[PDB]
Amino acid sequence: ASVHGTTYELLRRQGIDTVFGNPGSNELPFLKDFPEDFRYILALQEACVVGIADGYAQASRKPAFINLHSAAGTGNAMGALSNAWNSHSPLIVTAGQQTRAMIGVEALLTNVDAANLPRPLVKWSYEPASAAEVPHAMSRAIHMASMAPQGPVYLSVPYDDWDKDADPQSHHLFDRHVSSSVRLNDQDLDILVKALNSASNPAIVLGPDVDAANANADCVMLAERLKAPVWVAPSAPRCPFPTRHPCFRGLMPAGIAAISQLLEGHDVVLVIGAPVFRYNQYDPGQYLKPGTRLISVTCDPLEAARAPMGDAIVADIGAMASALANLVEESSRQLPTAAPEPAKVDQDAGRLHPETVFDTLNDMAPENAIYLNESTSTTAQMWQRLNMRNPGSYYFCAAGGLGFALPAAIGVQLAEPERQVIAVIGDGSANYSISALWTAAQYNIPTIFVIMNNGTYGALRWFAGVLEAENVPGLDVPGIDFRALAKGYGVQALKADNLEQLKGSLQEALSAKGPVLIEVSTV
Amino acid sequence: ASVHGTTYELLRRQGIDTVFGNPGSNELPFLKDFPEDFRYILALQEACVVGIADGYAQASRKPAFINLHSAAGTGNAMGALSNAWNSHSPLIVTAGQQTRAMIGVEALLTNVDAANLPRPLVKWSYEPASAAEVPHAMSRAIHMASMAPQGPVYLSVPYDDWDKDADPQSHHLFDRHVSSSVRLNDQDLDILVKALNSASNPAIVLGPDVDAANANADCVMLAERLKAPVWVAPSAPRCPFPTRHPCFRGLMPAGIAAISQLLEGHDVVLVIGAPVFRYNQYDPGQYLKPGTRLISVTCDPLEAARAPMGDAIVADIGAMASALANLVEESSRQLPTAAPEPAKVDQDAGRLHPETVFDTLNDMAPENAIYLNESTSTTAQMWQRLNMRNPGSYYFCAAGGLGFALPAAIGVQLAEPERQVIAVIGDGSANYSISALWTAAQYNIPTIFVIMNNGTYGALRWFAGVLEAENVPGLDVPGIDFRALAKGYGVQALKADNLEQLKGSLQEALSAKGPVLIEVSTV
Amino acid sequence: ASVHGTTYELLRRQGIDTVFGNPGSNELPFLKDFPEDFRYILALQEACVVGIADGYAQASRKPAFINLHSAAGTGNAMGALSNAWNSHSPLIVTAGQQTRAMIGVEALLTNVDAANLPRPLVKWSYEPASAAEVPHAMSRAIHMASMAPQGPVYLSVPYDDWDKDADPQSHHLFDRHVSSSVRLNDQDLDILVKALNSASNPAIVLGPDVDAANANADCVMLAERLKAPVWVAPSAPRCPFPTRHPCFRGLMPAGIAAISQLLEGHDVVLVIGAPVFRYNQYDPGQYLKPGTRLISVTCDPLEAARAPMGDAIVADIGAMASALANLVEESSRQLPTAAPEPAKVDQDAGRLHPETVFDTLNDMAPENAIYLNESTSTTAQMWQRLNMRNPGSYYFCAAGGLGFALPAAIGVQLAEPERQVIAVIGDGSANYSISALWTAAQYNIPTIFVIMNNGTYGALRWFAGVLEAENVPGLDVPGIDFRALAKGYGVQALKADNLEQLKGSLQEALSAKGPVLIEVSTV
Ligand SMILES: Cc1ncc(C[n+]2csc(CCOP(=O)(O)OP(=O)(O)O)c2C)c(N)n1
Ligand SMILES: Cc1ncc(C[n+]2csc(CCOP(=O)(O)OP(=O)(O)O)c2C)c(N)n1
Ligand SMILES: Cc1ncc(C[n+]2csc(CCOP(=O)(O)OP(=O)(O)O)c2C)c(N)n1
Ligand SMILES: [Ca+2]
Ligand SMILES: [Ca+2]
Ligand SMILES: [Ca+2]
Ligand SMILES: [Mg+2]
Ligand SMILES: [Mg+2]
Ligand SMILES: [Mg+2]
Ligand SMILES: [Mg+2]
Ligand SMILES: [Mg+2]
Ligand SMILES: [Mg+2]
Ligand SMILES: [Mg+2]
């Protein structure tokens, strides 16, 4: 067998059947004789390729395979990898290298010091020392991406390697099963459970690794048992809990003082599947108030190490959530009461308030819709106004890096063909990965893109307001026609200048047979 | 509180009370007002400092704290860190940096690009962005070193940071408990146990992480239950099993073909706490023979990823070994029969055969002796001739890097004051970290050093023999007087030119009140 | 031809004929069939190997070739590389890697992420992608080490590469000549010369790259022409000027305020071949006083970039010094008057004052002696008391990393067989690379080692004194018998407890036919 044949067999035997890519000459020897059981998803720029693959992996809860062109292609995707690192996304990023005979002279297309390029944003980064090592290296990449804590990995392969003879002993790679589905030992788990049972006023904080593990339902059971309020950890990349469940208390503000104030009076706070904490704004104060102790369950040693407070347990979120939910006592305390419905903001016949947009989406979208958020000044209102009952219903750029949601929404829709994906994206954010629209058109992936057009980098204008910062340049983005951009890439386009038009546009989009972009004129 | 005060409080609250170091000017502001409850262990070169700390950590099964001088001191210790990486040793390596005001100009003693210096040999490597961050950074270092898979970490601290005011919120760091004591979920564990119960001819292979976890006794129970032969994985850094237990089959040869041949006919091979496998010599063949399937339990995702065959489970070795030992059925098969005693090699009244030396050590040493091995051509015979009944009885440089055993033997003896440590070190190996002898003398750490003097790099002469390589320079090391070197550093010295003298020297050494070096004239 | 044959031909054609090494199994395929026109210099630990090679390169003013064993051997040499980086030493460091077939599984002796290991202490660091690339990679290493600014480089080679067929086109590598012997363009050089001619009170500061370039004599002419005082830049790794020349003003204190005060009243300060500046102690103040402007000539862009003041020219020191010396006018100003002889310190019949030792060395040593300094508390007095008329007469660890002088003194003596080398080394410093003594004995390299024994890390006790730092541990190093250590490694040993004995010991050492160590009892 050739290295080509052996590698594709390894991939299929490990459950991989799709290649997200933007091709180049170093990659042609890999892509030639493309297996008929594989499919290739092309995107026009590498931030888009990786974004689509990211959404696909996160929604599918399995590794996604990417093929990029050398250094330039890898480099174009680096911003996307920053998000993927923060969301623990299992991405196998492969990049083609020059033929081994031409690497020394640094011919055009040589990826110099390749393994160092994507660092520090990958778990593992490697170029094999020989062609016959390629399948083994790929095996390592697959497992490194897939083991908790999941994350992106990088493999560079000289283009001449593919046609070489493979090592017959590579067959041992094909069916390897590697598990990190582990939980705390019985003795210490019993101690934790007793601490939870004995809490007088427990609180629960959930992060994205809960949704990644599909531990949502187990966490619901856990919260019901403990009769505990449930918060989502700040800067949330995913939604780990039904947002209209009586225990739900919403998204935590990303501030030290704000969070300790919120947790005041809670004697035990159990954090599951989140960093402690992904703060953002400067908000100095106490990490925790006197009387509050914190216990964190995390799949990532790096999270456990850097928490400034509390105890920590490093284990699989799925296994831990299931164990806790089934071991804790049913508290005799009263179940928390559901949060009241959000108020309806006054809305005239003119430009749309973001609150109106979200209320309308919630009214019209299917109960199993999936939302993506890259409307950076409206996040708080979005979280308050969308009823998300099911797992996998929300994605937001995990490192705050714009250019995620547009392509990721396409990958999510590919992963979940029966769930309507609706991406809500600011006019500023929409530009970073605008060319991703073409992939939705070409493959007829019926994502709905809602562009919130207020003509400015609104979040930045706000922050600049609090800083009292004057004379800041570059905050306005006037003069973009999003319907024209959609037309450019073959996506049906609608405009909503008022509520009447928004309702009409959504009705049309929800019944369309392909992707649709709606440009919404917002305050 | 100052950063100095807060950091030392964090250290003591996290169980650290010893600093292994070689001081410099960047470190004086850290070492001043040295806490009276701490002790400082000085060594004369940094390979020695880290070697001593390594032995101490491995034997004590807890993190060891090191303080080195900037780049030059860190660099001197890099070889030692290569071993520490391979042995999963929990080492917290701190190095002093220039004052922040002088870093930009790159004053003398500035550690440039500090975090990159020790890579790729550390799990985490960092320099804090401000003085007040130092305690938090130290907390991260402690936990990163201590979490499975354990390993060395690096923290660089500008010397002006220590006197600065600490953040009062740093108190939350002091008592953090972080656990990675996890094991496979019940459902999948039941599947594994059933596979072991159903095996017709199981074999067990154990690596160093078993001894590190003190899982030895649990593995004995497991082997007795399964009535399974037990091997030690190749290139063994530690001893994970009683060497005269009936199930013990010895050290595996570090070759692909050799190991698959050894495992032939065994239907299920369970590897615990080892890489799969730390091969060494070129010995091409099948990774496993038809009929053999392999299951690996490892604490290290990097080990699980790179195994060329078998299934893998990433979990704590202590928790997994305990669970398996207590869950498996008692097989009705006959218990394996103990390996026969080694033959006595013919010995005249002249120079000592290594076999004679080991037989004599086994005859005279206490039953709870601890051995270190850096006699590279005699490893196989050592493993066959020393009865090691207890855990923590053997250490060998885990990356094959010479200069480990001499200093590590001092750290081991410090960790285990009631167990006689005997380091068996070749005349070549003895030189790499010779100055470590001084620390044994100064602190009266009563390690016995047995120098095997054959005048050559024997292992290299052998390999060169197999390669049929002619005209290889640099293989001979004549003209070293080890008694004089011992005298130089204040250690009692004896010479053994024959068996009569060896017995006499050992009698004296075993009854001495301080460290002793015995130079043995070997074939 | 084989890769082995081709590589050795490239080496000899590029002027390399010596390999400084400590061998290992990954290196045996390189060292086998060792060319009869090459010689191999063995040292017992890698800090020693690199130190010897460093001294050899610095004294010979040409690249030195080193061969180490994988990661552990490279790591052991990292401290030595920190000095080599700072001294711009042209060192070609090669390390053997595992066979390509075993790299993936990370067999014992695999150098993982090899190229990253020695960073940030090398100019270039690489592992070739194929065997046939090895000669080309070596060519790159040779030239990267040799081009201004000179420095250490690193090449990792899988052991199976050597026996493979070489590319016939590699012959084009053999005779490549690469030059960086450049100087400022005529127009701008004329501007500089006019600025020097027009200075009313110029000063000159010289660094180690002057001595490396053998530009010393040109700088003497330049100083005589300009009638300018000459200082040596702080933390001096070499001596760039005759120390009894009338213009000589000695070693600058390594402080910001001290240096600006020293330069006060000098309108133009010309720095040649030094960083601006290698300050050490905290000594805040003005970089330059009003009225002083600085112009730096440096071979290193990194030096030019980081200077906090002055203009800079990046060019070859030899070419620039020659041009300036021959272009500037002869000033009508009076030639500076020579510095007065140092005072004679009162000396009783007991322990030696360092001043006495240096005065005696100056009295008895040949006029073409070469000194090395690793007696860290006595540097100022050494610089004042040794008359060094010739180039290449002084070496001091360029990064302040101890363990340099002992081995480097052996390499220097090898480079300069007709110049008596005398290394003055503190009792603390002597231990770091003590095993280097063996190489001097084995090859009969007649270096004289003067050990200054005061029982303490004296420089550190002093600094701790100024810091007013109490309770600092680890500052004393009692109980070392250096005569015994010398005997251990086969070097003749003498002791000097007083002046009478010092004179007698020096008389014997200077007439000896081999290396000699003198242990001096100092205050
Ligand atoms: C790749 C990238 N570039 C720049 C930024 C900085 N940034 C954060 S929010 C923001 C404004 C986004 O504007 P828009 O998408 O219109 O949403 P709005 O703030 O108007 O609601 C910018 C530029 C970022 N987070 N990521
Ligand atoms: C730091 C380091 N340098 C070099 C080597 C290569 N090496 C491996 S075994 C060996 C010989 C050791 O000789 P000795 O200690 O006398 O034991 P013997 O082989 O004679 O039994 C050498 C040089 C190494 N493993 N580590
Ligand atoms: C490799 C290394 N480790 C530690 C230091 C810190 N250091 C600088 S000077 C010094 C003392 C040297 O003592 P000695 O050689 O006896 O000279 P003295 O100061 O007594 O004159 C030390 C430990 C260093 N510079 N390099
Ligand atoms: Ca906007
Ligand atoms: Ca030997
Ligand atoms: Ca001293
Ligand atoms: Mg596999
Ligand atoms: Mg258990
Ligand atoms: Mg802590
Ligand atoms: Mg379970
Ligand atoms: Mg490094
Ligand atoms: Mg060349
Ligand atoms: Mg010109």
Q: What is the DSSP string of A437-477?
A: HHHHHHTT---EEEEEE-SB-HHHHHHHHHTT--S--S-B-
Contacts of B63 (CB under 8 A, 6+ apart): B15, B16, B57, B90, B91, B92, B142, B145, B146
To the nearest 10 degrees (0 to 180), the angle between helices B499-511 and B354-364 is: 40
| Residue C131 DSSP class | G
Q: CB contacts < 8 Å between B and C, how many?
A: 314
Which of helix, strand or coil describes residue C197? helix
Residue B54 φ then ψ, to 5°: -60, -50
CA pair distance C517, B83, nearest whole angstrom: 34
Upper half-sphere CA count for residue B360 (Cβ side, 13 Å): 23
Task: Work out the number of other CB atoms within 10 angstroms of the CB of residue C52.
Answer: 33
Cβ-Cβ contacts under 8 Å for A84 (sequence gap 6 or more) = A50, A54, A91, A121, A151, A152, A398
Pocket test for ligand 1, best of A353, A429, A434 (most atoms within 8 A of CB): A429
Q: Which two tokens stand for residue A410?
A: 């396409």
Q: How many helices (H) and strands (E) does chain B have?
A: 20, 20
Ligand 2 pocket residue status of B403, Cβ below 6 Å: yes
In eight-state DSSP terms, residue B203 is E
Chain A touching partners, 3 or more CB pairs below 8 A: B, C
Q: How far is CA B262 from CA B253, B256, B258, B265, B272, in A?
A: 9, 10, 6, 9, 17
DSSP B403-449: TSHHHHHHHHHHH-TTS-EEEEEETTGGGTTGGGHHHHHHTT---EE
Asked if C455 contacts C478 with a C-beta cutoff of 8 angstroms, the reply is yes
Provide the 3-class DSSP secondary structure of residue B339.
Answer: coil
Question: Rounded to whole angstroms, what are the CA distances from A470 to A283, A474, C57?
Answer: 22, 12, 58
Contact indicator for B91, B398 with CB cutoff of 8 Å:
no
A314 and A329 Cβ atoms separated by less than 8 Å: no
Separation between Cα atoms, residue B492 and residue B488, nearest integer Å: 10
Atom of ligand 2 nearest to the CA of B401: 26
CA distance C77 to A500: 75
Decide if domain B179-340 falls under CATH 3.40.50.1220.
yes
Cα end-to-end span (Å), chain A: 62
Please tell me if the domain spanning B179-340 has the same topology as the one spanning B341-523. yes
CA-based nearest residue to B262, from B330, B332, B201: B201
Task: For ligand 3, say whether the CB of B21 is within 6 Å of any of its atoms.
Answer: no
The DSSP code for C164 is S
Question: Which residues touch B187 (CB under 8 Å, ≥6 apart)?
Answer: none
In the DSSP assignment, the letter for residue B234 is: S
Q: Is C346 exposed, middle or buried (0-12, 13-18, 19+ CB in 10 A)?
A: exposed
Q: Which residues from B are below 8 Å from C278, CB to CB?
A: 106-108
Beta carbons of B305 and A178 less than 8 Å apart: yes
Strand, helix or coil at B321? helix
Q: Is A375 in the pocket of ligand 1 (CB under 6 A)?
A: yes
Q: Give the SS3 label for residue C281.
A: coil
Least Cα distance to B316 among B235, B385, B214 occurs for B214
**What's the full length of chain C, in residues?**
523
- Both tokens of A257, joined, read 């003082």
Touching chains, C (3+ CB pairs < 8 A): A, B
Ligand nearest to the CA of A323: 10
Cβ atoms B139, B176 nearer than 8 A: yes
User: Which residues does chain A have within 8 Å of residue C155's beta carbon, measured at their own beta carbons?
Assistant: none
**C-alpha span between A503 and A509 (Å, rounded):** 10
Going from the C-alpha of A24 to that of each of A41, A95, A104, A159, the distances in angstroms are 14, 9, 20, 11
What's the half-sphere exposure (Cβ side, CA atoms, 13 Å) at C413? 26
Cβ density class A108-145: b for 16+ within 10 Å, e for less: ebbbeebbebbeebbbbbbbbbbbbbbbbbbbbbbbbb
In this structure, the number of other CB atoms found within 10 A of the CB of residue C337 comes to 9
Q: Which residues pair with B519 in a beta bridge?
A: B451, B495
d(CA B171, CA B9): 9
Nearest-angstrom CA–CA distance, B522 and B506: 15
Helix (H, G, I), strand (E, B) or coil at C176: coil
Closest CA relative to residue B488, chosen from C453, C105, C406: C453
Q: What residues does each domain of chain A span?
A: 1-178, 179-340, 341-523
DSSP state of C252: P
Using CA atoms, how far apart are residues B219 and B217, in angstroms rounded to an integer? 5
Return the bridge partners of C517, or none.
C449, C493
Cβ contacts (< 8 Å) between B322 and chain A: which residues? 185
Place of tokens 């491995």: B58
Strand partners, A374: A425
Name the phi and psi angles at C37, rounded to 5.
-90, -5
Does the distance separating the beta carbons of C484 and B108 come in below 8 Å? no
**Cα torsion A192, A194, A199, A202: sign:** positive
Q: Is A251 annotated as a binding residue?
A: no
Test A314 with B147 for CB contact under 8 angstroms: yes
| CA–CA dist C194, A410 (Å, integer) | 68
Question: For a substitution probing ligand 2, which of B377, B434, B449, B477 has the most ligand atoms within 8 Å of its CB?
Answer: B377
Distance, in Å, from the CA atom of C160 to the CA atom of C3, rounded to the nearest integer, reads 10
Residue A485, φ and ψ in degrees, nearest 5: -60, -45
Residues C284, B101: C-beta atoms closer than 8 Å:
yes
Q: Alpha helices, DSSP H only, in B252-341?
A: 256-263, 301-306, 317-327
Cα–chain center distance at C327:
30
Q: How far does residue A89's CA lie from ligand 11's centre (Å)?
A: 28
Residue C452 and residue C357 in contact, taking contact as beta carbons nearer than 8 Å: yes
Query: How far is A409 from A451, CA to CA, in rounded Å?
Result: 13
Give kind and range of the element (H or E) at residue C483.
helix C482-488
* Cα nearest neighbour of A185 on chain B: B182
Superfamily designation of domain A1-178 = Thiamin diphosphate (ThDP)-binding fold, Pyr/PP domains (3.40.50.970)
CA separation for the pair C474, C460 (Å, rounded) = 10
Is A341-523 a domain of CATH 3.40.50.970? yes
Q: Min CA distance, A328 vs chain B (Å)?
A: 17
Size of interface A-C (CB pairs under 8 A): 41
Distant-in-sequence, close-in-space partners of C120: CB < 8 Å, separation ≥ 6: B112, B113, B116, B117
What's the burial of C347, exposed, middle or buried (CB within 10 Å: 0-12/13-18/19+)? middle
